[PDB]
Short mmCIF file of all heavy atoms in Angstrom, two decimals:
data_model
loop_
_atom_site.label_atom_id
_atom_site.label_comp_id
_atom_site.label_asym_id
_atom_site.label_seq_id
_atom_site.Cartn_x
_atom_site.Cartn_y
_atom_site.Cartn_z
N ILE L 983 54.51 -189.41 -178.73
CA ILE L 983 55.56 -189.26 -177.74
C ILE L 983 55.41 -190.32 -176.66
O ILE L 983 56.36 -190.63 -175.94
CB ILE L 983 55.59 -187.84 -177.16
CG1 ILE L 983 54.47 -187.63 -176.14
CG2 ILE L 983 55.51 -186.81 -178.28
CD1 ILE L 983 54.68 -186.44 -175.24
N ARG L 984 54.22 -190.90 -176.54
CA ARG L 984 54.06 -192.01 -175.60
C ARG L 984 54.63 -193.29 -176.18
O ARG L 984 55.40 -193.99 -175.50
CB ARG L 984 52.60 -192.18 -175.23
CG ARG L 984 52.39 -192.88 -173.91
CD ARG L 984 51.28 -192.22 -173.11
NE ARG L 984 49.97 -192.50 -173.66
CZ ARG L 984 49.25 -191.61 -174.34
NH1 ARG L 984 49.72 -190.39 -174.55
NH2 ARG L 984 48.06 -191.95 -174.81
N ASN L 985 54.30 -193.59 -177.43
CA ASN L 985 54.71 -194.85 -178.05
C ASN L 985 56.22 -194.90 -178.24
O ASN L 985 56.84 -195.95 -178.08
CB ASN L 985 53.98 -195.03 -179.39
CG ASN L 985 54.19 -196.40 -180.02
OD1 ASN L 985 55.28 -196.75 -180.47
ND2 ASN L 985 53.12 -197.18 -180.06
N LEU L 986 56.83 -193.76 -178.58
CA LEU L 986 58.28 -193.71 -178.64
C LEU L 986 58.88 -193.84 -177.26
O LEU L 986 59.99 -194.36 -177.10
CB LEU L 986 58.74 -192.43 -179.32
CG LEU L 986 58.37 -192.33 -180.81
CD1 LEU L 986 58.95 -191.06 -181.42
CD2 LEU L 986 58.80 -193.56 -181.57
N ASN L 987 58.16 -193.38 -176.23
CA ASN L 987 58.62 -193.65 -174.88
C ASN L 987 58.31 -195.08 -174.48
O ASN L 987 59.00 -195.65 -173.62
CB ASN L 987 58.01 -192.67 -173.90
CG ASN L 987 58.85 -192.50 -172.67
OD1 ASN L 987 58.92 -193.39 -171.82
ND2 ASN L 987 59.52 -191.36 -172.56
N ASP L 988 57.28 -195.69 -175.07
CA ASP L 988 57.07 -197.12 -174.83
C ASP L 988 58.11 -197.95 -175.54
O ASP L 988 58.37 -199.10 -175.15
CB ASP L 988 55.66 -197.58 -175.23
CG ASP L 988 54.55 -196.86 -174.49
OD1 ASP L 988 54.52 -196.94 -173.24
OD2 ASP L 988 53.71 -196.20 -175.14
N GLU L 989 58.72 -197.41 -176.60
CA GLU L 989 59.77 -198.15 -177.29
C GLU L 989 61.03 -198.22 -176.43
O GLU L 989 61.63 -199.29 -176.30
CB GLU L 989 60.09 -197.49 -178.62
CG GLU L 989 60.73 -198.42 -179.64
CD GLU L 989 62.25 -198.46 -179.57
OE1 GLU L 989 62.84 -197.67 -178.80
OE2 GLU L 989 62.85 -199.28 -180.29
N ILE L 990 61.43 -197.09 -175.85
CA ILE L 990 62.66 -197.01 -175.06
C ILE L 990 62.54 -197.87 -173.81
O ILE L 990 63.51 -198.49 -173.37
CB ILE L 990 62.96 -195.54 -174.73
CG1 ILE L 990 63.19 -194.77 -176.03
CG2 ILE L 990 64.16 -195.39 -173.81
CD1 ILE L 990 64.47 -195.15 -176.74
N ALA L 991 61.33 -197.97 -173.26
CA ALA L 991 61.10 -198.91 -172.18
C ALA L 991 61.18 -200.35 -172.68
O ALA L 991 61.61 -201.25 -171.95
CB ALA L 991 59.75 -198.64 -171.52
N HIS L 992 60.78 -200.59 -173.93
CA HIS L 992 60.69 -201.97 -174.41
C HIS L 992 62.06 -202.50 -174.83
O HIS L 992 62.36 -203.68 -174.61
CB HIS L 992 59.70 -202.05 -175.57
CG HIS L 992 59.90 -203.25 -176.44
ND1 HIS L 992 59.81 -204.54 -175.96
CD2 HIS L 992 60.17 -203.35 -177.76
CE1 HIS L 992 60.03 -205.38 -176.95
NE2 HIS L 992 60.25 -204.69 -178.05
N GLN L 993 62.90 -201.65 -175.42
CA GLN L 993 64.21 -202.12 -175.86
C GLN L 993 65.25 -202.00 -174.76
O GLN L 993 66.43 -202.28 -174.98
CB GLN L 993 64.66 -201.35 -177.10
CG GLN L 993 64.80 -199.85 -176.89
CD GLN L 993 66.20 -199.44 -176.48
OE1 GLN L 993 67.15 -199.61 -177.23
NE2 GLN L 993 66.33 -198.93 -175.27
N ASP L 994 64.83 -201.53 -173.58
CA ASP L 994 65.73 -201.24 -172.47
C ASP L 994 66.42 -202.51 -172.00
O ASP L 994 67.64 -202.52 -171.79
CB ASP L 994 64.94 -200.60 -171.32
CG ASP L 994 65.83 -199.90 -170.28
OD1 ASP L 994 67.05 -200.16 -170.20
OD2 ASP L 994 65.30 -199.04 -169.54
N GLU L 995 65.66 -203.59 -171.87
CA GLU L 995 66.24 -204.86 -171.44
C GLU L 995 67.12 -205.46 -172.52
O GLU L 995 68.06 -206.21 -172.22
CB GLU L 995 65.11 -205.83 -171.06
CG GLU L 995 65.50 -207.20 -170.45
CD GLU L 995 66.44 -207.13 -169.25
OE1 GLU L 995 67.67 -206.95 -169.42
OE2 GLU L 995 65.94 -207.26 -168.11
N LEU L 996 66.86 -205.12 -173.78
CA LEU L 996 67.65 -205.66 -174.88
C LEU L 996 69.07 -205.11 -174.86
O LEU L 996 70.03 -205.84 -175.10
CB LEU L 996 66.98 -205.36 -176.22
CG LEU L 996 66.24 -206.53 -176.88
CD1 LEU L 996 65.79 -206.16 -178.28
CD2 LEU L 996 67.11 -207.78 -176.91
N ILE L 997 69.22 -203.83 -174.53
CA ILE L 997 70.57 -203.29 -174.38
C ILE L 997 71.10 -203.62 -172.99
O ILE L 997 72.30 -203.48 -172.72
CB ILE L 997 70.59 -201.78 -174.67
CG1 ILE L 997 71.96 -201.37 -175.18
CG2 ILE L 997 70.21 -200.98 -173.43
CD1 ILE L 997 72.35 -202.06 -176.47
N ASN L 998 70.23 -204.06 -172.09
CA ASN L 998 70.69 -204.44 -170.76
C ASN L 998 71.18 -205.88 -170.74
O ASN L 998 72.22 -206.18 -170.16
CB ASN L 998 69.57 -204.24 -169.74
CG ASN L 998 69.46 -202.80 -169.29
OD1 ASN L 998 68.60 -202.45 -168.48
ND2 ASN L 998 70.32 -201.95 -169.82
N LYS L 999 70.43 -206.79 -171.37
CA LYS L 999 70.82 -208.19 -171.30
C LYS L 999 72.00 -208.46 -172.22
O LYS L 999 72.78 -209.38 -171.97
CB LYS L 999 69.63 -209.09 -171.62
CG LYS L 999 69.32 -209.32 -173.08
CD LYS L 999 68.28 -210.41 -173.25
CE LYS L 999 68.12 -210.81 -174.70
NZ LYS L 999 69.35 -211.47 -175.23
N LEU L 1000 72.17 -207.65 -173.27
CA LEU L 1000 73.36 -207.81 -174.10
C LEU L 1000 74.56 -207.14 -173.45
O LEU L 1000 75.70 -207.36 -173.88
CB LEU L 1000 73.12 -207.27 -175.51
CG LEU L 1000 72.60 -208.28 -176.53
CD1 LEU L 1000 71.15 -208.69 -176.32
CD2 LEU L 1000 72.81 -207.76 -177.94
N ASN L 1001 74.34 -206.33 -172.43
CA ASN L 1001 75.44 -205.96 -171.55
C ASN L 1001 75.76 -207.13 -170.63
O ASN L 1001 76.91 -207.34 -170.24
CB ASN L 1001 75.06 -204.70 -170.76
CG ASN L 1001 76.24 -204.05 -170.03
OD1 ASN L 1001 77.35 -204.58 -169.98
ND2 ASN L 1001 75.99 -202.88 -169.47
N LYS L 1002 74.75 -207.95 -170.32
CA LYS L 1002 74.98 -209.10 -169.46
C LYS L 1002 75.49 -210.29 -170.26
O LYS L 1002 76.32 -211.07 -169.77
CB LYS L 1002 73.69 -209.46 -168.72
CG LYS L 1002 73.78 -210.69 -167.81
CD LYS L 1002 72.53 -210.89 -166.98
CE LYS L 1002 72.73 -211.94 -165.90
NZ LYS L 1002 72.91 -213.30 -166.46
N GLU L 1003 75.02 -210.45 -171.50
CA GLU L 1003 75.34 -211.64 -172.28
C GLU L 1003 76.80 -211.66 -172.69
O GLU L 1003 77.44 -212.72 -172.68
CB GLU L 1003 74.43 -211.72 -173.51
CG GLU L 1003 74.70 -212.88 -174.46
CD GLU L 1003 75.54 -212.47 -175.66
OE1 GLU L 1003 75.83 -211.26 -175.79
OE2 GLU L 1003 75.90 -213.35 -176.46
N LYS L 1004 77.36 -210.50 -173.03
CA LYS L 1004 78.75 -210.46 -173.47
C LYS L 1004 79.70 -210.67 -172.30
O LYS L 1004 80.77 -211.28 -172.46
CB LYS L 1004 79.04 -209.14 -174.17
CG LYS L 1004 80.34 -209.15 -174.94
CD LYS L 1004 80.51 -207.88 -175.73
CE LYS L 1004 80.57 -206.69 -174.81
NZ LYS L 1004 81.52 -206.91 -173.69
N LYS L 1005 79.34 -210.19 -171.11
CA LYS L 1005 80.26 -210.30 -169.99
C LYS L 1005 80.30 -211.72 -169.44
O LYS L 1005 81.33 -212.16 -168.92
CB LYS L 1005 79.90 -209.27 -168.91
CG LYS L 1005 78.68 -209.55 -168.05
CD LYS L 1005 79.05 -210.10 -166.67
CE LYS L 1005 77.81 -210.40 -165.85
NZ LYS L 1005 78.15 -210.87 -164.48
N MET L 1006 79.20 -212.47 -169.55
CA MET L 1006 79.27 -213.87 -169.17
C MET L 1006 79.92 -214.68 -170.28
O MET L 1006 80.47 -215.76 -170.03
CB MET L 1006 77.89 -214.43 -168.81
CG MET L 1006 77.04 -214.93 -169.97
SD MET L 1006 75.40 -215.48 -169.44
CE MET L 1006 74.47 -213.95 -169.49
N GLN L 1007 79.86 -214.18 -171.51
CA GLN L 1007 80.74 -214.69 -172.55
C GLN L 1007 82.17 -214.24 -172.31
O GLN L 1007 83.12 -214.88 -172.78
CB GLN L 1007 80.26 -214.24 -173.92
CG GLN L 1007 79.07 -215.01 -174.46
CD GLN L 1007 79.44 -216.40 -174.92
OE1 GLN L 1007 79.51 -217.33 -174.12
NE2 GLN L 1007 79.66 -216.55 -176.22
N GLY L 1008 82.35 -213.13 -171.58
CA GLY L 1008 83.68 -212.66 -171.25
C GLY L 1008 84.44 -213.62 -170.35
O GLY L 1008 85.67 -213.69 -170.40
#
Side-chain angles (χ1 to χ4, degrees):
Chain L
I983 77 162
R984 203 138 72 255
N985 188 291
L986 293 184
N987 205 287
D988 300 301
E989 203 270 354
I990 298 291
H992 159 60
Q993 61 92 63
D994 196 341
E995 185 52 281
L996 257 188
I997 208 61
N998 279 179
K999 82 171 190 66
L1000 269 72
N1001 193 353
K1002 178 173 191 293
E1003 177 262 355
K1004 193 174 63 48
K1005 75 101 182 183
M1006 85 183 87
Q1007 282 287 83

